[PDB]
Amino acid sequence: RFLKVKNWETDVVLTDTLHLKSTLETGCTEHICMGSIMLPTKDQLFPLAKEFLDQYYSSIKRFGSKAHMDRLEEVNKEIESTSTYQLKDTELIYGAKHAWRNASRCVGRIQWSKLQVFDARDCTTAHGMFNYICNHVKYATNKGNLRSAITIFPQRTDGKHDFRVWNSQLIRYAGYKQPDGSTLGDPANVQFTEICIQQGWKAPRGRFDVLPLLLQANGNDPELFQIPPELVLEVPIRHPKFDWFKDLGLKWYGLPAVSNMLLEIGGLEFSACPFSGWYMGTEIGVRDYCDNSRYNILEEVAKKMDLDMRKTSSLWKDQALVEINIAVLYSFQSDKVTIVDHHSATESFIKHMENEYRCRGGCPADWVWIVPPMSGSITPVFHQEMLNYRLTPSFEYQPDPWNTHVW
Amino acid sequence: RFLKVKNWETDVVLTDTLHLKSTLETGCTEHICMGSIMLPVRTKDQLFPLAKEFLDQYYSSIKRFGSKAHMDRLEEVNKEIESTSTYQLKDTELIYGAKHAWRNASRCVGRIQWSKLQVFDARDCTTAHGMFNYICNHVKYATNKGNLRSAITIFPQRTDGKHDFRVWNSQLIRYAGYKQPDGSTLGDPANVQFTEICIQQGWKAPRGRFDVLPLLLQANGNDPELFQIPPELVLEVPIRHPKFDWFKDLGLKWYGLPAVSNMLLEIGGLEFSACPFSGWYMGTEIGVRDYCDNSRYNILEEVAKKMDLDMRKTSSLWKDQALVEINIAVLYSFQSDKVTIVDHHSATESFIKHMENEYRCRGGCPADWVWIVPPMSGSITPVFHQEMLNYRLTPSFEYQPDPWNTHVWKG
Ligand code: HEM
Ligand code: HEM
Ligand SMILES: Cc1cc(N)nc(CCc2cc(N)cc(CCc3cc(C)cc(N)n3)c2)c1
Ligand SMILES: Cc1cc(N)nc(CCc2cc(N)cc(CCc3cc(C)cc(N)n3)c2)c1
Ligand SMILES: [Cl-]
Ligand SMILES: [Cl-]
Ligand SMILES: [Cl-]
Ligand SMILES: [Cl-]
Ligand SMILES: [Zn+2]
Ligand SMILES: [Zn+2]
Ligand SMILES: [Zn+2]
Q1: Which residue in A48, B47, B131, B261 has a CA-CA distance of 20 to 30 Å to B240?
Q2: Does the annotation count A109 as an active-site position?
Q3: Full set of structural domains in chain B with CATH
Q4: Does A103 contact ligand 1 (Cβ within 6 A)?
Q5: Mutate to test the pocket of ligand 3, among B384, B387, B388 (most ligand atoms within 8 A of CB)
Q6: Whose Cα sits closest to atom 4 in ligand 1?
Q7: Residues A349, A384: Cα–Cα separation, whole Å
């Protein structure tokens, strides 16, 4: 009921009391831990509404006030009548900021209160969606000086009028299977690229083709739109000491913008809610460049470095991995595009977590994701025990729309 | 029930049925996952089912389930429990149990080797002097002049909890740590408390950076006694780097035999509180944890200085660069001196092959991702993208409290 977490580097011990407000399931049981599994009605809605409105009213120091009670009744009334309800703007901004606050897999949550929420609940068409998105992209990008944002489209109704961004991120590179058997571009986006072509996109068939947006308004069939190239800030990748690095032909985009998740606030479901921040360097240099199912360039970089690749024990993979990550950071910094390295991001997070422990009573965190995908042990999060539990408002996974949408 | 795990690199999906045999708890609930928490006398009543469980597994493994030998063994154990409150394992059962506790060790990446464990039965041991002899023998055998062999030594089981055998050392071989008055630490900061006990017990500390600790050994619940391991039995490797000639002048060395001696072995409900076991090192345990943890030798700054990296900002990745160089050094030194060691790529690759084979033949392989993923370069190893299920099978190794915390002193 009071839970202790220890830091094995500093001996510091912290007490979590926030977990007693956990609600959704973890996937784990007393018999089996699923901590490393990536995906482990009117009657239903009012409790969720109440739970949310109670936390909102508590947060502005107005708990049990007539204004609190009157909103509970109003929402109760509207649920009884319409089977759903509408959030006040203040509630929407609170709910969104808190869904980020509660994202146990996010190392960047120190920034959670500074989120810019764009309310797009008046949107009715895919063209309208496209406009809201370009606006979000321009605002978030800010000529390289990135600002966090989320844009919130209309909430689910019957579940057959869903708004969805079919892209998994607003900005991402196409993937194509070649007669050769190999893959050109990003292998992660092969499927989504084919649907784009099936829908009518003229693919440039290159290595770094920014995908078009495929947008679904009001449950209608989704539509293609090209983001104005001038709004997609990209960074060519060079290394501060290896001149040959640039020749590998590498570049990436400055804006990480997740667009396939669902935002849940007070039982209400926001199926299109793209949100963006800025990159931690390892996301591009370790995952995007170096996963075997991604650009997979470790081999080619190690070769240009003339490392000995005869035996794994030379740590050639590791040497190359560092230099690739050095080059990413260097390139973003030289072009004045916001980026954070994993030492700085995790130090910031440990500061955030201690802040949350004193002020909120805990900070749900998923160690498997919070510890960076390289040099884990030499970052201050490795030795930090974490408790992982689900608080609402939250971001949730949802299935890809092509598996569900009826044409 | 069937449980699926996926590999996000290869899309290979595996099905777990072995979790149905799980017992003890994880610490987790449907409301809270404690997957990253490091640590979240038995009655006749609880003992016979534990024994039966174990002997059913044992007789299955040998294709003799339900046999006359099986049933006679259940009955023989049952009555021994009735009349003595405990029972004795056959040697065959002990070997099987120990091998399985390793096979079931969800935090161990080295499990491909589980079936080749040399088991030394020390249940006839009665004194600390006897323990010391058993341990020197274990060390000499396991070390094998640098061609390392896995081994475990098993001392008598717990009886009433007042007569425990305990190795007070957390590992058989480890370096002393000394807190200086100015607040610095000489040698290994992990062993300061234990070093202090040793000294209090009469150990004459050399007070150097790499002093091999004496063994502190408790037999039959008696006060523990000090013994120095013969230096000729302690294999050590001077650490140097294949390209950087100044690396040797850091004065680093490490011991070749990792030998955990503070855990408890549970088999068939019996508790073996002194069961030191050893294998060989994965390079990162020395180069990442032992050398570069801030609470350990903490040499990252010194190495980076000598390399003349840009240390003005974390974003040059100077710490990562030095980390890789130190780990390169450790593996190069070990290989050159022909002392068994495994790099993290080869170890995790072997583990994945082990794990898949365990799914085919056993219906699962419980694994703790937090420990299985190496402490550097996680994502470029094949375990990072591997979903794992963590649950507890017996026989097992368990944590137990440090003995200076519970021991009743006799004087
Ligand atoms: C401001 C800069 C931000 C940074 C540096 C950052 C960092 C990260 C990282 C590194 C991960 C996954 C671990 C990895 O990729 O290695 C992640 C996950 C996540 N973040 Fe952030 N984040 C930022 C902003 C945001 C914002 C603005 C939101 C929402 C408003 C958000 C919500 C999430 C969620 C829901 C996940 C989990 C995604 C999933 O389960 O797939 N983050 N974050
Ligand atoms: C043969 C070579 C072996 C290798 C390379 C190896 C490797 C490792 C590593 C790397 C870890 C923890 C992860 C880390 O420290 O970064 C570990 C943990 C562990 N291994 Fe092994 N292992 C070996 C042999 C053994 C043997 C012989 C046993 C027992 C019979 C054993 C049982 C365990 C246990 C119980 C843990 C968890 C320790 C704890 O919770 O503190 N391993 N192993
Ligand atoms: C808003 C925001 C900003 C920012 N800078 N970064 C993000 C996360 C984006 C992200 C995108 C993808 N495709 C995969 C992962 C990790 C996928 C993963 C992680 C682990 C630990 C294991 C595994 N199998 N997969 C993270 C969001
Ligand atoms: C028999 C054997 C052979 C072999 N090569 N290695 C071992 C494991 C030895 C070991 C010893 C210590 N002191 C700490 C750890 C990990 C400590 C740790 C890991 C993680 C993931 C987090 C954390 N806080 N602490 C492991 C046993
Ligand atoms: Cl990405
Ligand atoms: Cl990934
Ligand atoms: Cl160690
Ligand atoms: Cl550690
Ligand atoms: Zn769990
Ligand atoms: Zn990856
Ligand atoms: Zn450590």
Answers
A1: B261
A2: yes
A3: 16-123+150-160+264-278+348-372 (3.90.340.10), 124-149+164-235+399-403 (3.90.440.10), 236-258+281-346 (3.90.1230.10)
A4: yes
A5: B384
A6: A108
A7: 11
